[PDB]
Curated annotation (Swiss-Prot), chains A, D, F:
It is found in: Membrane, Clathrin-coated pit; Cytoplasm. Diacylglycerol kinase that converts diacylglycerol/DAG into phosphatidic acid/phosphatidate/PA and regulates the respective levels of these two bioactive lipids. Thereby, acts as a central switch between the signaling pathways activated by these second messengers with different cellular targets and opposite effects in numerous biological processes. By controlling the levels of diacylglycerol, regulates for instance the PKC and EGF receptor signaling pathways and plays a crucial role during development. May also regulate clathrin-dependent endocytosis. This is Diacylglycerol kinase delta. The gene is DGKD. Homooligomer. Monomer. Interacts with AP2A2; regulates clathrin-dependent endocytosis.
Length: 68, 67, 67, 68, 67, 68
């Protein structure tokens, strides 16, 4: 289960875990593997479709909250 | 506790700063409690805030929240 | 050494990342070794890559090449 | 010979020097003087006809590799 | 001061760049001083300039005017 | 008088104020209200009839020079 080995579906849970299920799609289409998450930057999220800041933040912080 | 401020809890805060004119976006962007705590100049720029005196007012209202 | 990777050397790499589905363009665009080392989000977007998880996979495969 | 004083033909060599002779034409038509090179941006190259990324890159890096 | 360059003031400038062959359009389009200061790649493309080396020459002659 | 509330005639002055009176017509026909001005883009101007760059620029800059 290493954060870095999360298959695309592993990530999905996570988001669902943040109540951001509504993003499970794209995050899946863009083959967002475990590791990928760990480096998403505001722009990646913008390219990934996320726009409500409170969500980028929510996702972004859900990340530091991961590696760490 | 800020850490759990619903989107409406934040609203008050802004209104407490006399920045009510921003309660909209801050609400649309689902700016939860925690989110505030990490806004960076850019987030505010993306959030619509532009008058520096306001970005600062909001940003310091944050430093003046966690600490 | 990457710095001299012919267009086919790069190909392997991609295939090493399981991104074989990109070996085409990367070859058409005469993506030599050095070129890789400087691809920027845009180059990848121009290069056809779009699934973020891939741009990242490629980009990090690069940081994970020079360093 | 100052990079900034390269006449249009000076540039030409350079490209030929990168094995990008196939671009000597346009680069010449667009009166690409020495200095001009120094500021080409992805778009200039796209307007200049270059499309194979590996070439824009090759040219672009041939530039930092110049001024510097 | 550029900021007030009449259409003919601009003309000299171009001629100073050895881009006299453009003094026409730049004059027709009533390219006043200030206008120059904001030309963007497109304006030049609309203005007729096409040889990149010239758009650049003009554009930098501008950066090299305000600053 | 809020830039955004300029009636069609309010705009007119402005243009006349830029010595672009020769455009007061179209700008009036196209019911160019205050706010409208604030978002004109090169194309709007082209559709609006303005063609001498120095004028689009003049108008365009007369705008940033407004909101700001």
């Amino acid at each position: 289960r290493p954060v870095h080995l999360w298959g695309t579906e592993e990530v999905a849970a996570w988001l669902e875990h943040l109540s951001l299920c509504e993003y499970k799609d794209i995050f899946t289409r863009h083959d967002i593997r475990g590791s990928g998450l760990l480096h998403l930057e505001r722009r990646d999220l913008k390219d990934l479709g996320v726009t409500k800041v409170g969500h980028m933040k929510r996702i972004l912080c859900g990340i530091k909250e991961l590696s760490r």
